[PDB]
Amino acid sequence: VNKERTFLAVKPDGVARGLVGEIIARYEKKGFVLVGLKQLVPTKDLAESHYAEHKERPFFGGLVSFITSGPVVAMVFEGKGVVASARLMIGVTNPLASAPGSIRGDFGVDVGRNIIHGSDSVESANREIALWFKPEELLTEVKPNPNLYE
Amino acid sequence: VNKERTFLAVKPDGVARGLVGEIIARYEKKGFVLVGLKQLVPTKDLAESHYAEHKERPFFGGLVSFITSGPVVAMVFEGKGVVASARLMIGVTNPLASAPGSIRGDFGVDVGRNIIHGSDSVESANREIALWFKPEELLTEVKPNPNLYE
Amino acid sequence: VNKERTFLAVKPDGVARGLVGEIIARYEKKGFVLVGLKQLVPTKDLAESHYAEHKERPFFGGLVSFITSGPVVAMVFEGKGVVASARLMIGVTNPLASAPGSIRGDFGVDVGRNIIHGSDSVESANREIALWFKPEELLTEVKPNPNLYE
Amino acid sequence: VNKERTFLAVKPDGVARGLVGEIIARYEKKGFVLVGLKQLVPTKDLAESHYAEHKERPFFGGLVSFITSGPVVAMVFEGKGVVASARLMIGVTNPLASAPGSIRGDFGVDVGRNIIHGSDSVESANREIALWFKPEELLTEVKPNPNLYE
Amino acid sequence: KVNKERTFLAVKPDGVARGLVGEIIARYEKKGFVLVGLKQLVPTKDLAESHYAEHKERPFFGGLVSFITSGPVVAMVFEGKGVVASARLMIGVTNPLASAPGSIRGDFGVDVGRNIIHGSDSVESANREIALWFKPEELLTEVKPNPNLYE
Amino acid sequence: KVNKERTFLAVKPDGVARGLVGEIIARYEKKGFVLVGLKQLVPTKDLAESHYAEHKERPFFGGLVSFITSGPVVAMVFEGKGVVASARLMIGVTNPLASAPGSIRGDFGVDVGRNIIHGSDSVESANREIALWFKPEELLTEVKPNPNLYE
Ligand SMILES: [BH3-][P@@+](O)(OC[C@H]1O[C@@H](n2cc(C)c(=O)[nH]c2=O)C[C@@H]1O)OP(=O)(O)O
Ligand SMILES: [BH3-][P@@+](O)(OC[C@H]1O[C@@H](n2cc(C)c(=O)[nH]c2=O)C[C@@H]1O)OP(=O)(O)O
Ligand SMILES: [BH3-][P@@+](O)(OC[C@H]1O[C@@H](n2cc(C)c(=O)[nH]c2=O)C[C@@H]1O)OP(=O)(O)O
Ligand SMILES: [BH3-][P@@+](O)(OC[C@H]1O[C@@H](n2cc(C)c(=O)[nH]c2=O)C[C@@H]1O)OP(=O)(O)O
Ligand SMILES: [BH3-][P@@+](O)(OC[C@H]1O[C@@H](n2cc(C)c(=O)[nH]c2=O)C[C@@H]1O)OP(=O)(O)O
Ligand SMILES: [BH3-][P@@+](O)(OC[C@H]1O[C@@H](n2cc(C)c(=O)[nH]c2=O)C[C@@H]1O)OP(=O)(O)O
Ligand SMILES: [Mg+2]
Ligand SMILES: [Mg+2]
Ligand SMILES: [Mg+2]
Ligand SMILES: [Mg+2]
Ligand SMILES: [Mg+2]
Ligand SMILES: [Mg+2]
């Protein structure tokens, strides 16, 4: 329902490059609600559990290594179709082919330095949210906005 | 001819959410000239008449009724191929399927609260403008910018 | 009360320069509510009645002449201290001495081309509002925002 | 030393109004480094303790109570002279007297709903950070940018 | 190819006249591309004609050359991975009206002859173009790849 | 004085490295000032020393000259009514920390030695400065005053 959630995270490059506010504002302006937020330096295990679906992929080692090389800003947004929309708002894997207007499109040039992570399905979203957030960090008081929802 | 015009209106949600300036600014930046502007609390006649192509359609009631639920900023922009361009700049009926960079894409989530309306043809544009503005409310002498037009 | 109103107007240069949305957005973001809005080419009388307090000043003739040389976007905003705050947000007479962050400061360089007009007291505000707006163009339904007002 | 830190929090109004990203972005742009961040619904203890210098003061009740009324985005920024700089970037207690360009100046009107809080000294900063964040929540190894610092 | 690829971009006379130079450069900077060359000049007819050589016969040519030389132009060169194709994607398509919201031509233009900016269309055209508008000395040689941008 | 006054501004190495060139130029364009000169270069020690001549003896001098020449700089000249004083107002004060929100140094800096930009401080220093960094040919001569900007 309009309660669907998604997990997003500003990777070390996004954080190091000062893009955290910019990214949060894009989702705030869109109408999505911030139900979880925190900065932390990812643990090797965290990183490996997060990207477990890519553990056989060659790039996994370097990916895990970079995701744990500095602070990360993890977050969860709520709203009608927020998982697929946040994905749209991010762009595509390769920042160079991400359309102007998306986050990777407007700001990135390297796949390994693609600024932000976004869950790709409600299934991976729920999976990833529990992975990064305990229940006491997620808001329950989500009063819908009559201005954004019919 | 660089004289084409289109009707656009910021709905109660867009107005209530403070997006009038952001929206007007997007069209100014693009090169379009505002030849009519005014805020108002639309009448049932205006609303039902404006959306007169969706009489049988269900949502018609809530639609007609929402648009009359509060302040609406109506306007007419003039420019070369402004009708089609403005809808492109708007996005698609559904805000979630609206591409990043578009008005609906950047700011909404509900097809019910999709923030703005823009004519969909020159005929509907002419019909709509005739409906929202008296002729003395529209500018007449609009000089063709040497930087925008060849 | 938090119902105090003020009159503002984007002069011909402001309009011609495509600054209308930018200006409206600055007041929308601040928390002030748009209770009246319209574009029109000022009549000589309108202009003279508006600036009647300066009718003896040398610059009056040229001022009246310019204010009637093109479209103007007239508006009224409502909120706690909106008259003095809009003034602050405009800057000072001379755009060159208006602080960065204000409207004239960020965008102007000539006194005669100082982009916008703002009422200077509640008295002149009420005076100017009736001057430019009939009662049926002013909103009465002003539901305060629990987010902006304690 | 370029190691000074300050506590800042976006209040329920700023959060509810979608200003978290805009606010974080202002400090990022300035050159300050986020060394702590998290959203939460503050406890009465936290609120009353945080505003423990305004115990006798009247508004204390509503203050303590508003801050616990909904989600608050807390954070700690580090930089050279960040405590004084951040308050400057904030404005003044009163949003109407806050200069254009400042956070309060740009976005508020009510002293009650003045959107953000920022420490007012290094002592209050240290006291406040100790209060909102556990030490494991703050970054430790913060590299001094060659472009920002000499 | 490599992270040192380069492309030639120019803010046409209309773009400079409308005050879009800073907006355009900011877009390329925010994206992570490095400015290795930059200068404002009023192009000569010979520079213009040589630059648009490929359209030497096409009918809109004369008017094009005339306009390009009718006022100041801001020329520049940006370097980064796949910058030629990326810069084009950011500009839009020939007609501003057909250009997507988010692209430069999409966000600010409405007429083909006043489409704000030019971007090289290939590494080869880019290398030729850079050569025509900049003497080697005007181009940066040292460029520390940013670790935040490139792996 | 006149609507043709001019001033010399330069995006220091830190400003260029942080990607603030477009933001800064946009600010001056939005204000109504016209760009009559512009180019990116890595200053010579002699240009730097001559430019900051007035501080030739002051202790922070050596470090200053060293930094100004440690990377690319974007130099430019803007023209408009009272542009010298206006441009300074827009930059802020020497210390970025003391600079007002809204000013360039106020919005982006935090250290005096990394204060992003330089603006001439008088018509006389501006004329001298323009002369040192730009050959006459690089400067625009024709400038149609904009009727929307000037009465
Ligand atoms: B293909 P994917 O699911 O991979 C996850 C992240 O792994 C990184 N990566 C990926 C690939 C394919 C590579 O070659 N190198 C590399 O560093 C960045 C991806 O975001 O990408 P996405 O984040 O879903 O776009
Ligand atoms: B399909 P359309 O012409 O509909 C007009 C408006 O009616 C509202 N609407 C529409 C449909 C089809 C619906 O299911 N629910 C709903 O609220 C919003 C549309 O803007 O959309 P558009 O606004 O012209 O893009
Ligand atoms: B001194 P004031 O009340 O004058 C009204 C407008 O008149 C114009 N004007 C003023 C003066 C003093 C002048 O020399 N030339 C000129 O064109 C612009 C003012 O906004 O200014 P303000 O708008 O209240 O800042
Ligand atoms: B005077 P101060 O330290 O007060 C703290 C907060 O308390 C709230 N407040 C304050 C006062 C004095 C009042 O009358 N009403 C009110 O709601 C908002 C202040 O941020 O203000 P500041 O936030 O530190 O600038
Ligand atoms: B087809 P192309 O290479 O043309 C070069 C420039 O010529 C101008 N032009 C083009 C065409 C086709 C026309 O009809 N009128 C006109 O003024 C603008 C183009 O950028 O376009 P592009 O710049 O590569 O998008
Ligand atoms: B006092 P001033 O003319 O100095 C010129 C530049 O020298 C640098 N500087 C200055 C001083 C005084 C210092 O302590 N350290 C330092 O790095 C930056 C100034 O822009 O400053 P301004 O640039 O005119 O604000
Ligand atoms: Mg994936
Ligand atoms: Mg339709
Ligand atoms: Mg006055
Ligand atoms: Mg205090
Ligand atoms: Mg081509
Ligand atoms: Mg000095």
Q: What is the CATH number of the domain that holds C145?
A: 3.30.70.141
| C108: Cα within 13 Å, side-chain hemisphere | 31
d(CA E44, CA A77): 54
Q: Is C17 on the interface with F (CB under 8 A)?
A: yes
**F32 to C105: CB separation less than 8 angstroms, yes or no:** no
Which chain E residue's Cα is nearest to A13?
E148
d(CA F127, CA F111): 28
**Residue with CA nearest ligand 3 atom 20:** C93
Burial state string for B63-90 with b = 16 or more CB within 10 A and e = fewer than 16: bbebbbbbbbbbbbbbbbbbbbbbbbbb
Best residue in F97, F105, F108, F116 to probe D by mutation, most D CBs within 10 Å?
Answer: F97
Ligand with the closest atom to the CA of A114: 1
**E35 to F72: CB separation less than 8 angstroms, yes or no:** yes
Method: X-ray
Which residues in chain B touch residue E94, judged by CB atoms under 8 angstroms apart?
none
Looking at this protein, which amino acid is placed at residue F9? L
d(CA A74, CA F49): 48
Which H helix or E strand runs over D38? strand D33-40
Tally: H helices and E strands in chain B = 7, 4
Q: Report whether D129 contacts D4 (CB < 8 A).
A: no
Gap between the terminal Cα atoms of chain B: 12
**C25 to B27: CB separation less than 8 angstroms, yes or no:** no
For the Cβ of E123 lying below 6 angstroms from any atom of ligand 5, the answer is: no
Q: Is E108 on the interface with A (CB under 8 A)?
A: no
For the Cβ of B22 lying below 6 angstroms from any atom of ligand 2, the answer is: no
Q: Cα torsion at F9, F12, F15, F21 (round to 10°)?
A: 40
Which H helix or E strand runs over C6? strand C5-10
d(CA E67, CA E77): 21
d(CA D75, CA D82): 13
DSSP D119: -
Q: Cα torsion at A37, A43, A44, A50 (round to 10°)?
A: -20
Which residues in chain E touch residue B80, judged by CB atoms under 8 angstroms apart?
97, 110-111
Which residues in chain C touch residue B39, judged by CB atoms under 8 angstroms apart?
34, 36-38, 139
Q: Report whether D145 contacts D31 (CB < 8 A).
A: yes
Tracing tokens 């730009």 back to the chain, one arrives at F134
Nearest one of B125, A132, E29 to F25, comparing CA atoms: E29
Contacts of A12 (CB under 8 A, 6+ apart): A66, A67, A69, A70, A71, A72
DSSP B70: S
Domain interval for residue E78: 1-151
Q: Catalytic residue among B35, B85, B117, B118, which? A: B117
Best residue in A15, A90, A110 to probe E by mutation, most E CBs within 10 Å?
Answer: A110
Indicate if the alpha-carbon torsion angle D64, D65, D67, D71 is positive or negative.
positive
d(CA C78, CA C90): 16
DSSP secondary structure, A92-107, as one string: -SSGGGSPTTSHHHHH
For the Cβ of C59 lying below 6 angstroms from any atom of ligand 3, the answer is: yes
Q: Is B110 on the interface with A (CB under 8 A)?
A: yes
> What is the resolution in angstroms?
1.9
Q: Is A37 on the interface with D (CB under 8 A)?
A: yes
Q: Catalytic residue among E68, E116, E118, E130, which? A: E118
Gap between the terminal Cα atoms of chain A: 13
Q: How many domains does chain C have?
A: 1
Question: Taking a contact as any Cβ pair under 8 Å apart, which residues of chain F between 48 and 67 contact chain E?
Answer: none
d(CA B90, CA B115): 9
